[PDB]
Design an enzyme around this catalytic site. Structure first.
Site, mmCIF file in Angstrom:
data_model
loop_
_atom_site.group_PDB
_atom_site.id
_atom_site.type_symbol
_atom_site.label_atom_id
_atom_site.label_comp_id
_atom_site.label_asym_id
_atom_site.label_seq_id
_atom_site.Cartn_x
_atom_site.Cartn_y
_atom_site.Cartn_z
ATOM 1 N N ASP A 1 4.209 9.834 140.261
ATOM 2 C CA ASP A 1 3.790 10.684 141.356
ATOM 3 C C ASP A 1 4.976 11.081 142.235
ATOM 4 O O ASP A 1 5.050 12.228 142.682
ATOM 5 C CB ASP A 1 2.745 9.951 142.205
ATOM 6 N N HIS A 2 5.895 10.128 142.467
ATOM 7 C CA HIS A 2 7.067 10.256 143.321
ATOM 8 C C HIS A 2 8.214 11.008 142.635
ATOM 9 O O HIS A 2 9.248 11.261 143.267
ATOM 10 C CB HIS A 2 7.486 8.870 143.856
ATOM 11 N N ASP A 3 8.021 11.400 141.365
ATOM 12 C CA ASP A 3 8.956 12.248 140.631
ATOM 13 C C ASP A 3 8.440 13.702 140.733
ATOM 14 O O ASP A 3 9.203 14.650 140.565
ATOM 15 C CB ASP A 3 9.001 11.830 139.151
#
Ligand code: HEM
Ligand SMILES: Nc1cc(Cc2cnn(Cc3cccc(Oc4ccccc4)c3)c2)c2nn[nH]c2n1
Ligand SMILES: *[C@@H]1O[C@H](CO)[C@@H](O[C@@H]2O[C@H](CO)[C@@H](O)[C@H](O)[C@H]2NC(C)=O)[C@H](O)[C@H]1NC(C)=O
Ligand SMILES: *[C@@H]1O[C@H](CO)[C@@H](O)[C@H](O)[C@H]1NC(C)=O
Ligand SMILES: [Ca+2]
Ligand SMILES: [Cl-]
Ligand SMILES: [Cl-]
Lengths: 103, 464
Positions: A94-96
């Site tokens: 998600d944080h990519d």
């Protein structure tokens, strides 16, 4: 925008050669459907007391959370076919992909 | 002033408290909420949209950054070895930790006064959110430096820039491989996997790679997988006493736990050998995130499910039926129809009492309410949104690992051999890991294997 390259740029700029900002950082999200705001263009549904969404009163997020999401912790069912690693990769992934800034 | 005021003045959109609330007995109080930054501030012309601060590409930007000044800071400029910077004050049994950040208001310092351990610095600003996430970030940092080191012995003539770039390219590929080969098949199940992710043909410049507004909310389904504890296990995969089960409301921004309570190895063992929470229609999300989210760093504990619902409203997302229509799924109009869709009348009744119409159900709420697909952890609607987004991220990425010109046939053949348990082996003191698939394997010793059995990444095809 270079005609030939071996590596990705850090910002994602120049990935798509025709539209070089596509997928690049600090850019508005694409919309798959037109937005639905209380005033049509900016105010969120629930902003104005008394204003209904599709002829219905807007439910409080906390009330939905209290009535639908809430359950006793002791009752928790562990997944027989999934590890916490499955959860943690999901958030890391998600944080990519996305971070939505606030003021 | 959203952090402490309850007034609804832009950019504040506070969450009002209902009567007879189980935790907040003061109805004048609220849950703090800042509206997401508009793409076009103050406009009376444009329809409000939000900003993505990151690269949509599965490019390991949570490691390298999505902005060049940050990307530069994260690098080791002390030499020509192509490494990423490491913590200069602490190590995990001689192994690297992420550097610290220099924040104006650091939340990690609040989680423990005496420890005085600030937040970590990574490609993404949320790296210190929970020690499990920090551990994954710390693992990838180590993997880059490990690759940069091997490549240097292979190609001594390569400079820092070359080494940094080549390792980064490999790391990005490894994230793509783990995600598409091991992760998504387990999110979507096999039929949605075939439907939304058919066999890769080649790159296509007519596929918009951008992350859609709905995706920022639909992908929060993962909140239903969260366990109420952080689990730490020893060498023998036994509860690491004292405190083997720490409540999550005591681990948010607790970077001191990584530095002073054993490093990343016990956290990783806990992730591998503990089952994820199963999303059930009467057990959607735990109270550690529903009542005590960020409790030790804020004036009041937040409600993650409620924040998701307020966020979709902030983002002006259409309701449940509009997304079902977008997906080409039957649109329930009444409780009896919704009951059929959810294959559960009690939940449809519950939902209708709140929303009055399936048209008004908030996308996260509706999405997580649906019965899970066979061998998947989402319903048809989230499988469609998630599946659709990842196909665009793959087919619309010119640097996708399988695309012609990105890697050679030999480099691709080598990359196909990578796995997350192997990455763990190469960068920790962990000698016994999850059997592939890592995301499926959750029971020790049944689903566990030795490192020796796992194939290492052969970098021979990288010698110039
Ligand atoms: C494990 C602990 C986790 C915590 C504490 C956490 C916390 C949060 C919080 C506080 C937000 C912002 C909420 C708001 O104001 O609207 C958020 C957003 C988000 N979370 Fe979770 N989350 C976690 C795990 C996950 C997982 C496992 C997934 C997916 C598998 C996920 C995907 C997301 C996404 C997509 C957003 C929106 C991101 C953006 O564009 O800014 N989260 N989460
Ligand atoms: N869009 C999001 C947001 C969060 C919250 C968060 C965590 N770290 N940061 C950065 C950071 C940097 C500097 C001060 C900071 O203090 C806080 C503490 C509590 C609440 C807010 C800010 C936090 C924001 C997520 N957490 N997981 N996924 C997430 N997706
Ligand atoms: C904050 O971290 C400190 C370390 O700075 C923890 O302190 C330890 O506390 C135990 C008893 O609980 C003592 O036996 C140790 O000697 C303490 N360590 C040191 C170095 O002083 C403390 O537990 C943490 N705080 C909380 C509230 O968890
Ligand atoms: C830069 O690399 C050298 C070589 O390992 C290391 O000794 C030094 O600590 C590194 N600096 C940072 C900031 O990581
Ligand atoms: Ca990215
Ligand atoms: Cl959208
Ligand atoms: Cl440091």
């Amino acid at each position: 925008c270079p005609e030939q390259d071996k590596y990705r740029t850090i910002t994602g700029m120049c990935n798509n050669r025709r539209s070089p900002t596509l997928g690049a950082s600090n850019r508005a999200f694409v919309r798959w459907l037109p937005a639905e705001y209380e005033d049509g263009f900016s105010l969120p549904y629930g902003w104005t007391p008394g204003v209904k969404r599709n002829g219905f009163p807007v439910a409080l997020a906390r009330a939905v959370s209290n009535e639908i999401v809430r359950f006793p912790t002791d009752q928790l069912t562990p997944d027989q076919e999934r590890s916490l690693m499955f959860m943690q990769w999901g958030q890391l992934l998600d944080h990519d992909l996305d971070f939505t800034p606030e003021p | 002033n959203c952090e402490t005021s309850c007034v609804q003045q832009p950019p504040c959109f506070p969450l009002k408290i209902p009567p007879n609330d189980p935790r907040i007995k003061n109805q004048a109080d609220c849950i703090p909420f800042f509206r997401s930054c508009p793409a076009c501030p103050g406009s009376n012309i444009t329809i409000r949209n939000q900003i993505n601060a990151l690269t949509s590409f599965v490019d390991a930007s949570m490691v390298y950054g999505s902005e060049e000044p940050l990307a530069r800071n994260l690098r080791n400029m002390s030499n020509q070895l192509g490494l990423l910077a490491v913590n200069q004050r602490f190590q995990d049994n001689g192994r690297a930790l992420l550097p610290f950040d220099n924040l104006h208001d650091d939340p990690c310092l609040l989680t423990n006064r005496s420890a005085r351990i600030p937040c970590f610095l990574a490609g993404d600003t949320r790296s210190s959110e929970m020690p499990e996430l920090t551990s994954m970030h710390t693992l990838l940092l180590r993997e880059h430096n490990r690759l940069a080191t091997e490549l240097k012995s292979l190609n001594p003539r390569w400079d820092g820039e070359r080494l940094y770039q080549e390792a980064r390219k490999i790391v990005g590929a490894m994230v793509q491989i783990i995600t598409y080969r091991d992760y998504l098949p387990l999110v979507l199940g096999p039929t949605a996997m075939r439907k939304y992710l058919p066999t890769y043909r080649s790159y296509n410049d007519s596929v918009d790679p951008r992350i859609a507004n709905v995706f920022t909310n639909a992908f929060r389904y993962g909140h239903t997988l969260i366990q109420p504890f952080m689990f730490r296990l020893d060498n023998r995969y036994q509860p690491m006493e004292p405190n083997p089960r720490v409540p999550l409301s005591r681990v948010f921004f607790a970077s001191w736990r990584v530095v002073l309570e054993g490093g990343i190895d016990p956290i990783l063992r806990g992730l591998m050998a503990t089952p994820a929470k199963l999303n059930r229609q009467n057990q959607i999300a735990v109270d550690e995130i529903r009542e005590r989210l960020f409790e030790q760093v804020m004036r009041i504990g937040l409600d993650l499910p409620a924040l998701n619902m307020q966020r979709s409203r902030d983002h002006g997302l259409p309701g449940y039926n509009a997304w079902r229509r977008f997906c080409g799924l039957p649109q329930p109009e009444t409780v009896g129809q919704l009951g059929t869709v959810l294959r559960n009348l009690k939940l449809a009744r519950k939902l209708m009492e709140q929303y009055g119409t399936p048209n008004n159900i908030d996308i996260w709420m509706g999405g997580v309410s649906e019965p899970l697909k066979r061998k998947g952890r989402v319903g048809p609607l989230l499988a469609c949104i998630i599946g659709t987004q990842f196909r665009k991220l793959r087919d619309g990425d010119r640097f996708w690992w399988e695309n012609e010109g990105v890697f050679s046939m030999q480099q691709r053949q080598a990359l196909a051999q990578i796995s997350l348990p192997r990455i763990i082996c190469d960068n920790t003191g962990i000698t016994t890991v999850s059997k592939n698939n890592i995301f499926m394997s959750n029971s020790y010793p049944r689903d566990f294997v030795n490192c020796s059995t796992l194939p290492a990444l052969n970098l021979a095809s990288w010698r110039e």
